[PDB]
């Protein structure tokens, strides 16, 4: 949306020509009961899966999805077919005649790059017959002319859909009365959304149902009344949306903390399989692992405290899930990378004091050219503050430098508080660390 | 050659060397050719019109030469158009005919015309080359066959088709031409066996596998008045000799390869023949010019319900902008994250598609709720009076 959208709205102001400010591209192309009939065939409630439904609506030509996780099967086994593999004698000779000759629609789902070319003439002769076939593996390297027939949608999941499905799946397990009393109201409120639907309804009818003498009919001021009555029921659903956004979001506010955790974890150990292959494995996994262990260890009494006994125990469980794949080189990475993917959200810590912490002279004479490498390289927030005669001291901190073990007994007293917060205070005695010793 | 500047500064040594040898009309040519102005357009089938005048093909049209117009030649490529869509079922080509694109289409007449000749043509795909050549080989009376890459990837289809072809060629005598691309290579070899065909043509034991003499002597009876021996006698050896020379002479190939990947270089280095012989030619992406000309052409059909002036120009303008600009999304996403992405003119097409259809839905839908925007305007009205 912003790269293009800021990219499409400039080129019409150079252009001079007219156009109208605000995209709400959903809002406009489609009415929302198909939406909401799609949620409940499956479609992710969140704005990502609603263009991408939109872009499978409009079918411009067959698609063929990016699919990590599996949203687009399972939305295509319930959207409407609720299937032949590609692999298989039969489904070159027999699956092919059937589908082109009556349409039963032949899902395909092991696209690995390799397509047998008997494949492409059938794709470009029944008129009841369509075809939709994904991938599996992420990062496609699809022909150009792969790219020339069908449309390409990449349904790579984001951290932000991820929580809110792991909240309804926490919901769900901590406490069925809880989702009694979710799914109670939403239903609620859904039906009296449509309730203003219905309204809307009642508006059109008083408004070209007679299409002439409305004002004779008398009984347009019953239907004037009848308008207000309908408003009245909204007036409730309106206080509901308030009982709504408070008392669920607070039962989701005990929860939301936790699926911000756990979508954490999860694009911690997506990118360990880039780190080497075969460190690969589905979400599924990672689902089963965390409503299990709301079930091992979850409730006990004072739910508040069991809510920190969440923090405190799935992370153990899914950690020595993935150390028991881990090579001894990897140990001590993917425990690092868990910790920064945690604080990067939290404690907001800049991706640039990472690079810092990662990567990276005329003041000081007695240190040595190697360590002088590392003057030049921590010189260039208070790292450019200090290295003066605060730092070129030379009264005890020589003892320091000799001593080993310098972290723990002798600790800097350089920023002595900055240390005591703590906050931050590990990270920036961590850089400290890295650039001298 | 790649740039145009390159082709500017050729045709600025054209010009120089012109001036330069013809020291007696320079300022003729100053006035008429040497001006960057369209000059001398020369084509085959343009300049003469069969006229249908018992039969469609009243006569072969004259073939030496034609002059310049844009107009005629455009009219009669749509004529031929409607031809080749009754021709061929489902022939589904809406090809869009804007002046580069007619420029290639004389490019692949020149090279398939001519006796031994043959081009390789290269190009990103959508530059429609494989399209283009459909066309230029119907015109041309030429047959076409292209490899088909069985369940099991092999050897022999090469050989039998290339059997086939020589005999059209050969024996029938008949005019071909040959359409390989990179979908019909699998490995090196094929490459090997295309190559000695360009350059000698006898493949071993493949026509010399007791046949050679079955076929030949299916064939001296032209020769009794071909080379006319004073209608006597003929020989052996030489009947194969004039049989190489027919098959060379009516046996034209006409590659299509990518420019970029990996392949492509060393395959080249690897087979000297293949850029040797044939001629090269390059296609440029499509510039702002042909994108509105497209643009207008999808336009005028239509504008029926988007009536506005000086507002259209602009239009169809802003839409080549939109297309150049999805071009360098796609280099800054592959360049950031090392994901390929690619665009072809066809997807343009399909852009068009939805902007007409979901414009005659929402505007129809949405003017009948306008309508009845006007509709309580009938009522307020009424109610007033
Ligand atoms: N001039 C054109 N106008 C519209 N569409 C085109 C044009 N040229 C090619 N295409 C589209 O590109 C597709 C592939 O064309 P092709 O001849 O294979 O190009 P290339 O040889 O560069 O791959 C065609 O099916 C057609 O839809």
Redesign the interface.
């Given at each position: 949306n912003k790269?293009?959208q800021q990219?499409?709205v400039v080129?019409?102001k150079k252009?001079?020509?007219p156009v109208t400010p605000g995209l709400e591209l959903t809002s406009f192309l489609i009415d929302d009961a198909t939406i909401g009939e799609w949620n409940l065939q499956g479609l992710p409630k969140d704005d990502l899966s609603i263009q991408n439904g939109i872009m499978v609506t409009?079918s411009?030509?067959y698609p063929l999805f990016i699919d990590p996780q599996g949203q687009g099967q399972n939305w295509i086994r319930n959207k409407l077919s609720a299937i032949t593999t590609l692999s298989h004698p039969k489904f070159?000779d027999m699956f092919l005649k059937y589908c082109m000759e009556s349409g039963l629609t032949l899902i395909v789902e092991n696209i690995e790059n390799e397509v047998?070319?008997?494949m492409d003439p059938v794709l470009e002769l029944s008129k009841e017959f369509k075809l939709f076939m994904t991938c599996r593996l992420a990062?496609?390297?699809?022909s150009?002319?792969l790219?020339?027939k069908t449309t390409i949608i990449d349904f790579t999941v984001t951290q932000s859909g991820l929580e809110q499905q792991l909240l309804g799946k926490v919901i769900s397990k901590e406490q069925k009365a809880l989702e009694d009393s979710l799914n109670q109201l939403l239903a609620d409120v859904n039906q009296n959304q449509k309730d203003l639907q219905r309204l809307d309804k009642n508006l059109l009818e008083r408004?070209?149902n007679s299409q002439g003498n409305?004002?004779d009919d008398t009984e347009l001021m019953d239907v004037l009344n009848n308008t207000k009555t309908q408003a009245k029921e909204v007036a409730a659903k309106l206080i509901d949306a308030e009982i709504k956004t408070k008392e669920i979001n607070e039962k989701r506010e005990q929860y939301r903390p936790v699926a911000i955790r756990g979508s954490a974890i999860y694009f911690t150990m997506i990118e360990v399989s880039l780190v080497n292959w075969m460190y690969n494995s589905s979400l599924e996994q990672f689902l089963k692992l965390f409503i299990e262990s709301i079930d091992l260890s979850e409730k006990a009494q004072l739910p508040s405290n069991r809510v920190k006994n969440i923090i405190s125990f799935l992370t153990f469980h899914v950690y020595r899930y993935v150390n028991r794949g881990l090579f001894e080189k990897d140990k001590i990475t993917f425990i690092l990378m868990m910790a920064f993917k945690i604080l990067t959200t939290a404690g907001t810590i800049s991706s640039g004091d990472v690079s810092l912490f990662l990567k990276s002279q005329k003041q000081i004479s007695y240190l040595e050219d190697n360590q002088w490498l590392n003057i030049l390289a921590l010189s260039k927030p208070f790292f450019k503050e200090l290295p003066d005669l605060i730092s070129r001291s030379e009264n005890q901190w020589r003892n320091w430098i000799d001593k080993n073990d310098p972290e723990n007994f002798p600790i800097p007293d350089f920023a002595e508080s900055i240390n005591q917060e703590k906050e931050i205070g590990s990270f920036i005695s961590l850089c400290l660390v890295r650039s001298l010793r | 050659l790649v740039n145009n500047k390159d082709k500017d500064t050729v045709m600025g040594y054209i010009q120089e060397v012109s001036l330069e040898s013809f020291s007696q009309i320079e300022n003729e040519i100053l006035e008429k050719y040497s001006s960057e102005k369209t000059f001398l357009f020369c084509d085959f089938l343009r300049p003469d019109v069969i006229n249908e005048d018992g039969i469609i093909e009243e006569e072969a049209p004259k073939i030496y030469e034609a002059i310049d117009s844009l107009t005629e030649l455009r009219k009669r490529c749509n004529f031929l158009l409607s031809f080749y869509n009754d021709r061929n079922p489902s022939k589904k080509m809406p090809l869009v005919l804007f002046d580069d694109a007619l420029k290639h289409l004389l490019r692949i007449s020149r090279i398939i015309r001519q006796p031994r000749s043959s081009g390789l043509l290269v190009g990103?795909?959508?530059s429609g080359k494989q399209s283009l050549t459909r066309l230029a080989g119907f015109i041309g009376k030429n047959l076409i066959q292209q490899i088909?890459?069985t369940?099991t990837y092999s050897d022999k289809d090469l050989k039998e088709d290339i059997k086939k072809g020589f005999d059209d060629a050969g024996h029938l005598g008949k005019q071909v031409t040959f359409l390989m691309t990179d979908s019909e290579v699998k490995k090196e070899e094929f490459l090997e066996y295309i190559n000695m065909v360009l350059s000698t043509g006898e493949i071993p034991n493949l026509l010399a596998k007791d046949e050679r003499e079955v076929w030949l002597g299916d064939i001296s009876q032209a020769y009794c008045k071909e080379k006319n021996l004073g209608n006597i006698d003929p020989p052996q050896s030489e009947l194969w000799t004039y049989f190489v020379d027919r098959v060379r002479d009516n046996f034209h190939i006409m590659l299509c390869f990518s420019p970029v990947g990996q392949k492509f270089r060393e395959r080249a280095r690897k087979f000297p023949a293949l850029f040797n012989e044939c001629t090269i030619d390059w296609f440029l992406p499509w510039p702002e010019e042909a994108l509105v000309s497209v643009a207008e052409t999808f336009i005028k059909n239509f504008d029926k319900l988007d009536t506005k002036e000086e507002?259209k120009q602009?239009?169809m303008?802003?839409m080549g902008?939109?297309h150049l600009?999805v071009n360098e999304?796609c280099d800054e996403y592959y360049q950031k994250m090392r994901?390929?992405?690619?665009?072809?003119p066809?997807?343009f097409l399909?852009y068009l598609?939805?902007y007409k259809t979901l414009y005659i839905e929402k505007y129809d839908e949405l003017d009948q709720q306008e309508e009845?925007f006007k509709?309580?305007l009938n009522?307020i009205q009424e109610?007033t009076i």
């Open positions: 790269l293009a990219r499409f080129d019409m252009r001079g020509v409009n411009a030509r070159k047998d070319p008997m990062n496609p390297s699809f150009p002319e790219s020339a408004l070209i409305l004002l | 990103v795909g959508g088909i890459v369940k507002t602009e239009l303008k802003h902008n939109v600009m999304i994901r390929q992405v690619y665009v072809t066809k997807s399909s598609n939805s009845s509709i309580g009522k109610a």
